[PDB]
Design a protein around this ligand. Structure first.
Ligand code: CL
Ligand code: NA
Length: 129
């Protein structure tokens, strides 16, 4: 599923991301835009053979099991396939674990490079939250 901007904002708010670990909703929407262009079925293979999955491009190196990342971990206790659903629930629950791991939203390189320190409120402008 390819979400619209305000539609993912509404879904992320409905699923408890607004201000999670102190990150306003606009941070999460910005991160999803630049990780996946709001596409829940986004996948990208990393150089090391791990893969990033879903709207927040969660990595099989640490977070989910895909059976093809020798010696990775599965810290969200989910098949990576759970992170490609049209329902953003598994991606949100795993994103809540990641953002708690010590580095906050810096875990998402596109967030650090494209969203961090910007006017992230712009991402929820004109949306009924
Ligand atoms: Cl933080
Ligand atoms: Na893994």
């Amino acid at each position: 599923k390819v979400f619209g901007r305000c539609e993912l904002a509404a879904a992320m708010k409905r699923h408890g991301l607004d201000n999670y670990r102190g990150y306003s909703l606009g941070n999460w929407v910005c991160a999803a835009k630049f990780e996946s262009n709001f596409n829940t079925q986004a996948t990208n293979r990393n150089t090391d053979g791990s893969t990033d999955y879903g709207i927040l491009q969660i990595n099989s190196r640490w977070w989910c099991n895909d059976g093809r990342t020798p010696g990775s971990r599965n810290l969200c206790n989910i098949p990576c396939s759970a992170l490609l659903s049209s329902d953003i629930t598994a991606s949100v629950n795993c994103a809540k674990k990641i953002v708690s791991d010590g580095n906050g939203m810096n875990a998402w390189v596109a967030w650090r490079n494209r969203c961090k320190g910007t006017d992230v409120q712009a991402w929820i402008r004109g949306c009924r939250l």
